[PDB]
Amino acid sequence: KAKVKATLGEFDLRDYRNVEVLKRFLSETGKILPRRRTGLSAKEQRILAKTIKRARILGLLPFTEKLVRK
Amino acid sequence: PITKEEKQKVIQEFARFPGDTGSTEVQVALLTLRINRLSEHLKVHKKDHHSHRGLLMMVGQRRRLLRYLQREDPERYRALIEKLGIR
């Protein structure tokens, strides 16, 4: 495996309107990924959170999805 | 809020001489500005306790600067007081 930010360009961590990127921070289901897999740091992750939830309200990133296989 | 304009107008108003930021007179006036603000906050918003505690501490501060002035210049303290509405 590898972290998220390990492949990514310089990008606004506060910009909600950009889905293409934020998407890379969710799981197979809606759940925001943990530090371990997002390779961020405190202030980082903590920002990403609010960024994301802001986008969820604007109906871009999902509050949840379903899980294939199982 | 309060902006650097509101600040400066006050400071420059109470300056003992040009440039003084920290003298007693100035700190007391500045204080008093922020005091009277918080008064109007807790005029509505009475359910806000923690801001209130902050304002207690604030008045205890200005009172202590005044006790300093009075034991030091009786006059400057009188002028300060009458100028600001206090007592």
Place this chain on the structure above:
Amino acid sequence: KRQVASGRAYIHASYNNTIVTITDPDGNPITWSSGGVIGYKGSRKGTPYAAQLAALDAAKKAMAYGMQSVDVIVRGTGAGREQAIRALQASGLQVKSIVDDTPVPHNGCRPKKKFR
């Protein structure tokens, strides 16, 4: 006699029982089955075997009802939540996509003292 071809199957599973419900591609049910459906009575109901039998029964049912290819959705947890899945697999219905839908909430309701 709706003669329904390809369709969807809900497997609900709790620790106390299992229930399959076969339904049409937009969600209105067709047949259903459970541990009580087939002969089982008590605790015996939430065994995996009964889950096997349940699935199979609802499979035979839906097939004589004209079913062929099935998309499964699973809600819940308990023994033979998986056996119903292994059952539907080998049933003769064809398994399209198994999904897991188990609803979890965002903390709304204060759970029963048994569950806290």
Place this chain on the structure above:
Amino acid sequence: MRRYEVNIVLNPNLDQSQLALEKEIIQRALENYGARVEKVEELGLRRLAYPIAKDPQGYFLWYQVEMPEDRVNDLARELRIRDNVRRVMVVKSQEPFLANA
């Protein structure tokens, strides 16, 4: 005054009578509440994650503004009363915090 970003998501099934009309009443609420406009971007028709007002998609708008702070909440009262607009989100701007930088 301060600087805000107003998001609007409204129903995709409109035509140009209706599009004109809603955009104008947006203008009206800004003029009335005193919000000068820095930029605007119309993102347009985009596929949401979850249905809003039973609708599988949405029509998106973004207005960077400045305005008197204390009326921003009433500004949103008005923008929300509008029936064909199903989300309003107004937020004060932030400096562009970066990462991987």
Place this chain on the structure above:
RNA sequence: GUGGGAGAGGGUGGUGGAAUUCCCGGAGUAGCGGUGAAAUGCGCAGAUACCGGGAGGAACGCCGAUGGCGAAGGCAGCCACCUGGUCCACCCGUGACGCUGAGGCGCGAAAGCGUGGGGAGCAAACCGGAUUAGAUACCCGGGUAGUCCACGCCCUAAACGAUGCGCGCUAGGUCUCUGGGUCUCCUGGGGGCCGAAGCUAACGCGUUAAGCGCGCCGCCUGGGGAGUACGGCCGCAAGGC
């Protein structure tokens, strides 16, 4: 003072999704539920499982941490506004303005009281089913206060770091949050863990002291009787000091 910074610190309006319940509709039978097993209970007036729509209340998954903020109690969706505290850098301003703080005054989980709302889930009392020699309990099915909101009381607690506040001093190593740096590292400021010297009856503590000191407040003087009695104050009461 100026310039930056972090935060579930507080208050007010607003709004977003998951879930539970409930009502409307569709489709569909004979059970569902629940337990060690069971029964009560609900279901042919059609439940359960499924799909669409509506109403309402409460709480905010993932992020979330061995994390943060707060004087304490305590604080967690998102937005906005009103506001408190705190930290770093600059070394600019006042020039001892300091520390502590008997009494007073205000805040103070939960439960509890009052008047008025509200009610989804939960749930003392209660009503039933069981289990046991018996069940006044654990387990099950219902359920009222209450839990939520507004205003006013109550003022307790393992209100716990069982460690009162302030300052100076006394090896390090390591993990972490948040500032500033010429950013392998250095430097403030919080949070943990090992451990110098030292301390301790031991356990342990050890620059977040329980070490070495100074100031100030609180408090202790065998166990039971007893946080009882009496008196006083406070409280609508419950009861508190």
